[PDB]
Curated annotation (Swiss-Prot), chain A:
Belongs to the actin family. ARP2 subfamily. Component of the Arp2/3 complex composed of ACTR2/ARP2, ACTR3/ARP3, ARPC1B/p41-ARC, ARPC2/p34-ARC, ARPC3/p21-ARC, ARPC4/p20-ARC and ARPC5/p16-ARC. Interacts with AVIL. This is Actin-related protein 2. ATP-binding component of the Arp2/3 complex, a multiprotein complex that mediates actin polymerization upon stimulation by nucleation-promoting factor (NPF). The Arp2/3 complex mediates the formation of branched actin networks in the cytoplasm, providing the force for cell motility. Seems to contact the pointed end of the daughter actin filament. In podocytes, required for the formation of lamellipodia downstream of AVIL and PLCE1 regulation. It is found in: Cytoplasm, Cytoskeleton; Cell projection; Nucleus. It comes from the Eukaryota. ATP binds at residues 7-9, 61-65, 152-157. The modification N6-acetyllysine is found at residues 146, 169. The gene is ACTR2.
From Swiss-Prot, chain B:
InterPro entries: ARPC1, WD40/YVTN_repeat-like_dom_sf, WD40_repeat_dom_sf, WD40_rpt. The keyword Nucleotide-binding does not apply. PANTHER family: ACTIN-RELATED PROTEIN 2/3 COMPLEX SUBUNIT 1, ACTIN-RELATED PROTEIN 2_3 COMPLEX SUBUNIT 1B. One of its GO terms (biological process) is Arp2/3 complex-mediated actin nucleation. It comes from Bos taurus (Bovine). This is Actin-related protein 2/3 complex subunit 1B. GO terms for cellular component: Arp2/3 protein complex; cytosol; nucleus. Pfam families: WD40.
Swiss-Prot record, chain D:
This is Actin-related protein 2/3 complex subunit 3. The lineage of its organism: Eukaryota, Metazoa, Chordata, Craniata, Vertebrata. One of its GO terms (cellular component) is nucleus. Component of the Arp2/3 complex composed of ACTR2/ARP2, ACTR3/ARP3, ARPC1B/p41-ARC, ARPC2/p34-ARC, ARPC3/p21-ARC, ARPC4/p20-ARC and ARPC5/p16-ARC. Pfam families: P21-Arc (PF04062). InterPro entries: ARPC3, ARPC3_sf. The modification N6-acetyllysine is found at residues 55, 60. Keywords: Acetylation, Actin-binding, Cell projection, Cytoplasm, Cytoskeleton, Isopeptide bond, Nucleus, Phosphoprotein, Ubl conjugation. The gene is ARPC3. The modification Phosphotyrosine is found at residue 46. Belongs to the ARPC3 family. Component of the Arp2/3 complex, a multiprotein complex that mediates actin polymerization upon stimulation by nucleation-promoting factor (NPF). The Arp2/3 complex mediates the formation of branched actin networks in the cytoplasm, providing the force for cell motility. In addition to its role in the cytoplasmic cytoskeleton, the Arp2/3 complex also promotes actin polymerization in the nucleus, thereby regulating gene transcription and repair of damaged DNA. GO terms for molecular function: actin binding. One of its GO terms (biological process) is regulation of actin filament polymerization.
UniProtKB/Swiss-Prot annotation, chain G:
Disulfide bonds: none annotated. CDD domains: ASKHA_NBD_Arp3-like (cd10221). The modification N6-acetyllysine is found at residues 227, 231, 238, 241. It comes from the Eukaryota. The gene is ACTR3. This is Actin-related protein 3. It comes from Bos taurus (Bovine). The lineage of its organism: Eukaryota, Metazoa, Chordata, Craniata, Vertebrata. One of its GO terms (molecular function) is ATP binding.
Length: 195, 341, 166, 173, 138, 277, 399
């Protein structure tokens, strides 16, 4: 299976066959922990809160860690942020001031799925996994897709697994099924979330 | 007899054998165990391990083990190691939130309805020294709200968001012996679908098995109460309520049902097996801004003493943070016209 | 005239529709969301209903396992009420974060919309929330008339104070 | 910060914890004999108008204890001297006010007991009672050839004003 | 690349929900009892055989108006009487219809607010709850 | 403040502070001030050549030409005499004040300097008032484009003089409120009959005076009792501040409604928050 | 930039400074108050602001701009009607506006401000500047800096309270702001008190005034207290000034000698314990502290650019005193890092410039004159499509 390990350092999609790993297939993504904390900062600014990059990082890490999550259907996560107040949660800063967080809860992690949002070139963890697996002997495929294990502090975002399973189910229906809907029902992807 | 443990809802509760302690989830990610000292309640335990909101608790009387299901998709079995409780992770193999749990009468296994649209059945294998589970999947097309084992630790009632009340078989041969015939049927292989209500309305908030297990009743969101008699060809009797939906139900005798819910007060229904016809027995909570004991919706009701056969004391809890305790006899003396069974 | 029968009918329905509970998502690992909003699980959504007073006034109630969405169509006979109602509704929506059962934008075809979730019915006597929405339908029409008189009351004082200095 | 004394010598005798600082004077007392122009009593009078305004004063030397004593006393003279009518008259008021025995360390009434050490026996109690009155006398008169305007019968209102202010909010009274 | 997302893979997810879908009162007997000063009969007339299953809107819309027409043709001090000559099944259906007539405001939405009031005393708040829960309405 | 002041505070307070310093005998301060006034007016106050003892106050009106063609220059000289001088490069009119040669009672030169802007308009009204007071009819009408997109049309007749503004309410909203105010004006003769009859017209003028969703034609009608010399000055002080008065009040309403909506919503936030336990 | 200039409003604790941009000083400077009658008819309009409102007979005098308790929008809105249609006589629909806001002003307020400016007044443009920053820009004028920047420690001291504020590249390191319970009001009371214990015959009412007048006419910051008292007690003629006022009652003239208080007043800034039991920390320490609770990497660029701002920074030699004090603290520190080993000397520099009294309004005047201002400024259209939300962020510009 493939260990999609991502922490405060960097993202890695390292495949593993029967024995050990196959380095020729393991890839990297330039979007880890620190990279999502910042995009949050730069996101809380456009909202009315100016935190000092080199002095509030630690305080914004916790904010992310505490209220950040992976949206599933971004088009629907937007109507919730714009059309209603259900995503808005309060958060007390160390000095006592009480701020708010909303859309920027799911937007900050969305970088993993759209690197450009933080001006970085790639295709984003999901569209990266799909490629790392098609780049393997078709007869070693079924295994991988059936076995994708998430590890690393940056993989615990609420809804992360359900997104991948949707991203992949998307990349498949198009780039491996050429858009034939009547056969997606056969695509089985098991992304486990080992505690 | 009301007592408030808090103003936030009580998620679920589960008393021990003696009824000397009560375990509750204070809308929290944990379970609080209260013991009684005199006429004062006193928290004695804090079960912390879940990483999500606890959705169900069940206490195994004789073995004295607690089982809890969270939204973190996990389930833990709590064992009292002398002074404090240690949990043990039980992998239910699901991808959504656990929604409710129940230990089987034999305490050899527990069920776990869930969002993955599948019930889970777990048992311990002293061979490898850990729990394991098999899933009852079809024909479950939605989230599973409530569960209630049959006295024989094999049949299982289930109410789900797809509008159906169903009886299954959780027959796990690896821990119990072949099941004996039941009016529900003689064919009882694992996951077998014995019964299924025929309604397309209301979600099934709660399901209950009779004392002798040949009668099952459930409450739907269409403000109806239902009872299916296994000794009448599984013929189902239905009562169209005139108030808000009930979320909980239990038998207090073989022909008596007590259900609480969004009207915040417990009521009584009586099944007349003769005509296979349910009927409204009246309100049992009789006299913020409410004239009911509980202030918010009552969401769980259990039998405290006298089993479902001849219940003497039952208890209810709701979203108002309050836990009540009723006396079936006292209520009969307060209402002349209260005709139980 | 036709006001009490209208509100009393909307009060009933607001009572029927406001029975809900916490519900994790079937669709997303560890997400909780107003099902009447996202709408990705039809079985969890109740039938939408409408209470109408005349051809212009009406309420829209859309229930769900864990949330209700109420949309009111306020009264407006002339153009001054129309802009008054409009500036007023937008005034509140802009402050929706403090008026937590209020929805930032209306629902196509309605002047204002509430979004009551289980976390609300959990933290507040739901029989009151049903009062407050009826108390709102009552107070927003009274306020729109005060404003309408306020404007005229001053439109005249302002014309006489000028026209009299010649 | 507040003004500290600089008379601390690598070998200055000590009465209790207070520095037994040399002074030039003709009153009797254990006070040594000064050879230099100014003494701790001058230094105290020079810094008074400043120090008096301070609530907090750090004791750095056994020397500051004295400076603090003299200062507190100075405000005592301005209390008295505030109501009189001549350099000749005050020259006498500062005689009595200087002979009277104000509460010393260890005694109830002498503020700052947490800073000053009580005499460790009857001898010290007599020495320290002497080396204090001696200072109340010298610092006593010296305050006159200052407070009073060259035009007698005039207590310079440029000292009269600090009568209502207490150093470190403490008072020998 | 941001093209593969334009498609909703959830549509075809085999683990989704779908109802088990698959015929209207007889005008004659309705208009017949109506035009005969027998409104309490007309009501029972319409309320018979609701198109609860007709997958068509044109059809369900037909019975809607027949009932809609029977309710509007009622006197003030006349509704209640005929509301009480209906079993819970009846009331529950009426209340279903009353919320249909609420979608065609027609100079009628004030008379319905009268019906609703009566049917509410008889059917209770539960008859409204069942209108919101029905997965097969008119 | 219901009516808008006519005197321009920065002009008066800037001069007054310079004269005051001149009288007291202090060494003169350098002064450079840019600022404006309603209807696209721009002002400048400076020391020509860097002569800190001389203070100029020039005004700029894009529509000066139109005014000039009606008596502006003439009237401006009668009023400011020797204080008037050659207009600064950028402005149409300039007043100069020697800090060494100030009158006895400065209070009236300061008062008239603040009336600068108003004085350039006084011309065109005083003109047509005369025509009427003589019977000289048929005279064409003045057409001042006081705003990029607004015009005032003055013109006399036998027994009445008519001023006609053609203003524009930006926000589609303001048009609505506006009509309320104008309705009261067209009925003002019920509280003061010896007052200017007023008329109104929506989107279309009563040439090619633009027609638009956001355009209106207020038409005052002055009578002798207002156009004569006994009145004249007062009538001009009002009539020329009108257009700005109307918008001033249409905005003051909106701000009032806000204070309402504030307290009303604070009410709602109370009932609401009392459903909590 | 069009033919008209942008309006610049700087609402402070006790004084609202306003005027048009480009000018080097505010056309008006008034008390941040408004008086009303305490509404049917047009009573909302029946009010007054600034000076014309300090003692209005049948009127109530408010002060809606306070570092202490909740803000009044009904009032703030009116106070702006006159700031616009009476003082600046500016057609709002034709000028862009530059308003200021205190540090930590919540994003919600901005939306309110903007709800007013755009919906009530219809300004076609708006930009919300942050005081502490403009004051930094205002210091570029200083001939002590020929190198711009928006990174520094702004020590603002008005009449109400003093704020030591750090700024890294145009952004207020909010989490490091420190307040000091010492400002004009305190220096006054203190001087007032020092006079009661010495002078005689000062009209109990005009008591405060004589003080406020002494403070503004003879007060200054000295290098040393013993040496100052010395000077005064020696060459008494050279220093003791004289004041004479007019008894508002017996319309008689009263005279007094202005003495010690001249230097003793501003001294409470460096020895707060002199007149405030609770506080005691010398303004120089507070500033040391604030830069220490700041990103190590940006401390030096904060020590070399301490920008004074506010009327109470004016006392002759305020900066010379602040800077010597700060340097002694900071240097003594690094001296022990050697007595425990020798670092690299820290460059402490306090900046004084001609525009300090109204630094904030100056910087906002200059910046609203540049073309770059009309760009990083939210417009009408932007508001009628994205709404209030936009005014939550205001792009820093200048550097
Ligand atoms: C205490 O009352 C006030 C409340 C808010 C503010 N402001 C803001 O919140 C945004 S900028 C400033 C302000 C300044 C002038 C007018 C208006 Br409206 C608003 C304000 O100016 C500091 C004062």
């Amino acid at each position: 299976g493939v260990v999609v390990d991502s922490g405060d350092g960097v993202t890695h999609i390292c495949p593993v066959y029967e024995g050990f790993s196959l380095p020729h297939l393991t890839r990297r993504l330039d979007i880890a922990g620190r990279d999502i904390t910042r995009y949050l900062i730069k996101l809380l600014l456009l909202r009315g809160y100016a935190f000092n990059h080199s002095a509030d990082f630690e305080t914004v890490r916790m904010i992310k860690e505490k209220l950040c999550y992976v949206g599933y259907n971004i088009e629907q996560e937007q109507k919730l942020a714009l059309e209603t107040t259900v995503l808005v949660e309060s958060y007390t800063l160390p000095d006592g001031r009480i701020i708010k967080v909303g859309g920027e809860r799911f937007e900050a992690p969305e970088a993993l799925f759209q690197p450009h949002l933080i001006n970085v070139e790639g295709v984003g963890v999901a569209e990266l996994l799909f490629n790392t697996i098609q780049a393997a002997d078709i007869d070693t495929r079924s295994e991988f897709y059936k076995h994708i294990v998430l590890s690393g502090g940056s993989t615990m975002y609420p809804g992360l697994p359900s997104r991948l399973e949707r991203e992949l189910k998307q990349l498949y229906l198009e780039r491996v099924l050429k858009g034939d809907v009547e056969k997606l029902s056969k695509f089985k992807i098991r992304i486990e979330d080992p505690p | 007899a009301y007592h408030s443990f808090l103003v936030e809802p009580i998620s679920c509760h589960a008393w021990n054998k003696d009824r000397t302690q009560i375990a509750i989830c204070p809308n929290n990610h944990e379970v609080h165990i209260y013991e009684k000292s005199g006429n004062k309640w006193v928290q004695v335990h804090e079960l912390k391990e879940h990483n999500g909101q606890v959705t169900g608790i069940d206490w195994a009387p004789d073995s004295n083990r607690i089982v809890t299901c969270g939204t973190d998709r996990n389930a833990y079995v709590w064992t009292l190691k002398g002074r404090t409780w240690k949990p043990t992770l039980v992998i239910l193999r699901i991808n959504r939130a656990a929604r409710c749990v129940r230990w089987a009468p034999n305490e050899k296994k527990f069920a776990v309805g869930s969002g993955s649209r599948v019930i889970s059945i777990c048992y311990f294998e002293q061979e490898n020294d850990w729990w394991v589970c098999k899933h009852i999947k079809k024909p479950i097309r939605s989230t599973v709200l409530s569960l209630d084992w049959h006295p024989n630790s094999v049949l299982l009632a289930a109410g789900s968001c797809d509008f159906k009340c169903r009886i299954f078989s959780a027959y796990i041969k690896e821990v119990e012996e072949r099941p004996a015939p039941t009016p529900w049927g003689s064919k009882m292989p694992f996951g077998e679908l014995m019964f299924e209500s025929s309604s397309s309305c209301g979600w099934v908030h709660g399901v209950c098995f009779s004392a002798n297990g040949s009668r099952v009743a459930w409450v739907s969101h269409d403000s109806t109460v239902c009872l299916a008699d296994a000794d009448k060809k599984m013929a189902v009797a239905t009562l169209a309520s005139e108030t808000l939906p009930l979320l909980a139900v239990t038998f207090i005798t073989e022909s008596s049902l007590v259900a609480a819910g969004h009207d915040c007060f417990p009521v009584l229904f009586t099944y007349d097996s003769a005509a296979g016809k349910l009927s409204f027995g009246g309100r049992l909570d009789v006299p913020a801004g409410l004239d009911s004991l509980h202030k918010n919706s009552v969401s769980q009701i259990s039998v405290l003493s006298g089993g479902k056969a001849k219940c003497s004391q039952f208890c209810t809890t709701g979203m108002d943070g309050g836990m009540s305790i009723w006396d079936v006899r006292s209520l009969e003396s307060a209402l002349k016209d209260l005709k139980i069974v | 005239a036709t006001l009490r029968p209208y509100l009393s009918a909307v009060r009933a329905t607001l009572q029927a529709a406001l029975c809900l509970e916490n519900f994790s998502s079937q669709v997303v690992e560890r997400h909780n969301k107003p099902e009447v909003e996202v709408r990705s699980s039809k079985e969890l959504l109740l039938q939408p209903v409408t209470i109408s007073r005349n051809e212009k006034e009406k309420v829209l109630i859309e229930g769900s396992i864990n949330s209700v969405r109420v949309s009111i169509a306020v009264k407006q006979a002339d153009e001054i009420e129309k802009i008054l109602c409009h500036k007023f509704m937008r005034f509140m929506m802009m402050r929706a974060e403090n008026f937590f059962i209020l929805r930032r934008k209306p629902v196509e075809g309605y002047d204002i919309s509430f979004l009551i979730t289980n976390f609300h019915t959990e933290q507040m006597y739901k029989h009151k929330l049903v009062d407050f929405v009826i108390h709102f339908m009552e107070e927003i029409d009274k306020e729109i008339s005060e404003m309408k008189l306020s404007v005229n009351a001053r439109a005249r004082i302002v014309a006489e104070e000028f026209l009299k200095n010649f | 910060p507040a003004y500290h004394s600089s008379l601390m010598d690598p070998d200055t005798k000590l009465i209790g914890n207070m520095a037994l600082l040399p002074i030039r004077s003709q009153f009797k007392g254990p006070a040594p004999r000064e050879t230099k122009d100014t003494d701790i009593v001058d230094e105290a009078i020079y810094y008074f108008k400043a120090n008096v305004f301070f609530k907090n004063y750090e004791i750095k030397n056994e020397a500051d204890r004295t400076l603090i004593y003299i200062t507190l006393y100075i405000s005592e003279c301005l209390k008295k001297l505030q109501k009189c009518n001549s350099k000749s008259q005050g020259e006498k008021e500062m005689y009595t006010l200087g002979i009277t025995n104000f509460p010393i360390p260890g005694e109830p009434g002498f503020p700052l007991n947490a800073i000053y050490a009580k005499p460790a026996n009857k001898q010290e109690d007599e020495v320290m009672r002497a080396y204090l009155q001696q200072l109340r006398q010298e610092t006593g008169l010296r305050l006159c050839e200052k407070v009073f305007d060259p035009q007698n019968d005039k207590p310079s209102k440029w000292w009269t004003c600090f009568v209502k202010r207490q150093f470190m909010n403490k008072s020998l009274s | 690349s941001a093209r593969f997302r334009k498609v909703d893979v959830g549509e075809y997810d085999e683990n989704k929900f779908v109802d088990e879908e698959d015929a209207g009162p007889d005008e004659g007997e309705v208009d017949s009892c109506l035009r005969q000063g027998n409104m309490t009969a007309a009501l029972q007339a319409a309320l018979k055989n609701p198109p609860i299953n007709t997958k068509s809107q044109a059809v369900k819309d037909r019975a809607g108006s027949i009932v809609l027409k029977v309710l509007i043709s009622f006197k003030a001090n006349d509704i209640e009487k005929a509301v009480q000559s209906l079993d819970k099944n009846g009331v529950d259906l009426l209340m279903k219809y009353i919320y249909k007539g609420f979608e065609s405001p027609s100079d009628s939405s004030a008379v319905l607010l009268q019906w609703h009031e009566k049917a509410l005393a008889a059917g209770g708040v539960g008859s409204i709850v069942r209108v919101l829960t029905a997965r097969k309405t008119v | 403040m219901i009516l808008l002041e006519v005197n321009n505070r920065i002009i008066e307070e800037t001069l007054a502070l310079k004269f005051e310093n001149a009288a007291a005998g202090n060494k003169p301060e350098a002064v450079e001030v840019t600022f404006a006034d309603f209807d696209g007016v721009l002002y400048h106050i400076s020391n020509p050549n860097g002569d800190k003892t001389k203070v100029m106050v020039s005004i700029s009106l894009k529509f000066y030409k139109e005014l000039q063609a009606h008596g502006a220059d003439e009237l401006l000289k009668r009023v400011y005499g020797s204080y008037l001088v050659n207009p600064e490069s950028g402005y149409n009119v300039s007043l100069l004040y020697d800090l060494e040669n100030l009158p006895a009672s400065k209070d009236s030169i300061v008062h008239q300097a603040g009336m600068l802007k108003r004085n350039c308009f006084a011309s065109v009204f005083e003109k047509y008032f005369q025509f009427q007071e003589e019977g000289k009819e048929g005279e064409n009408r003045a057409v001042i484009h006081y705003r990029d997109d607004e015009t005032m049309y003055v013109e006399s007749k036998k027994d009445r003089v008519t001023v006609v503004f053609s203003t524009v309410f930006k926000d589609d909203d303001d048009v609505v409120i506006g009509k309320v105010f104008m309705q009261e004006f067209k009925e003002g003769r019920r509280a003061s009959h010896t007052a200017p009859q007023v008329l109104f017209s929506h989107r279309e003028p009563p040439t090619d005076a633009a027609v638009g969703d956001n355009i209106g034609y207020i038409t005052f009608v002055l009578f002798p009792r207002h156009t004569n010399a006994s009145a004249r000055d007062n009538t001009i002080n009002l009539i020329h501040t009108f257009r700005d008065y109307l918008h001033y009040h249409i905005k003051c309403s909106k701000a009032y409604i806000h204070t309402r909506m504030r307290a009303k919503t604070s009410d709602f936030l109370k009932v609401l928050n009392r459903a909590r336990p | 930039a069009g033919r008209l200039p942008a309006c610049v409003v700087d609402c402070g604790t006790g004084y609202t400074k306003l005027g048009y941009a480009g000018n080097t000083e505010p056309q008006f400077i008034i008390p941040s108050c408004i008086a009303i009658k305490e509404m049917k008819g047009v009573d909302d309009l029946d009010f007054f602001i600034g000076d014309e409102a300090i003692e209005k007979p049948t009127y109530a005098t408010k002060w809606p701009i306070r570092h202490g308790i909740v803000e009044d929008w009904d009032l703030m809105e009116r106070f702006m009607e006159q700031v616009i249609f009476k003082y600046l006589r500016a057609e709002p629909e034709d000028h862009y506006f530059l308003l200021t806001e205190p540090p930590l002003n919540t994003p919600e307020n901005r939306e309110y401000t903007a709800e007013i400016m755009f919906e009530s007044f219809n300004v076609p443009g708006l930009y919300i500047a942050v005081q502490a920053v403009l004051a930094l820009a205002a210091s570029w004028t200083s001939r002590q800096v020929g190198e711009r920047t928006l990174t520094g420690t702004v020590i603002d001291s008005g009449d109400g309270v003093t704020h030591v504020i750090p700024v890294a590249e145009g952004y207020v390191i909010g989490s490091c702001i420190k307040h000091i319970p010492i400002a004009g009001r305190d220096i006054t009371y203190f001087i007032q008190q020092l006079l009661r214990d010495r002078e005689v015959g000062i009209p109990p009412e005009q008591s405060l005034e004589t003080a406020k007048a002494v403070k503004e006419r003879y007060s200054y910051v000295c290098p040393d207290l013993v040496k100052e008292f010395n000077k005064y007690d020696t060459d008494g003629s050279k220093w003791i000034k004289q004041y004479t006022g007019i008894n508002a009652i017996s319309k008689k003239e009263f005279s007094i000698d202005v003495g010690y208080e001249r230097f003793l007043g501003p001294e409470i800034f460096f020895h707060p314990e002199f007149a405030n039991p609770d506080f005691t920390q010398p303004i120089s320490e507070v500033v040391d502290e604030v830069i220490q609770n700041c990103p190590i990497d940006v401390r030096r660029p904060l020590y070399k650019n301490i920008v004074l701002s506010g009327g109470s920074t004016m006392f002759r030699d305020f900066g010379r005193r602040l800077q010597r004090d700060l340097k002694r603290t900071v240097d003594a520190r690094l001296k022990l890092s050697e007595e425990l080993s020798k670092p690299k000397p820290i460059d402490v520099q306090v900046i004084t410039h001609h525009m300090q009294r109204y630094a904030v309004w100056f910087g906002g005047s200059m910046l609203a004159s540049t073309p770059e201002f009309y760009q990083v400024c939210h417009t009408k259209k932007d508001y009628e499509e994205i709404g209030p939300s936009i005014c939550r962020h205001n792009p820093v510009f200048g550097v």
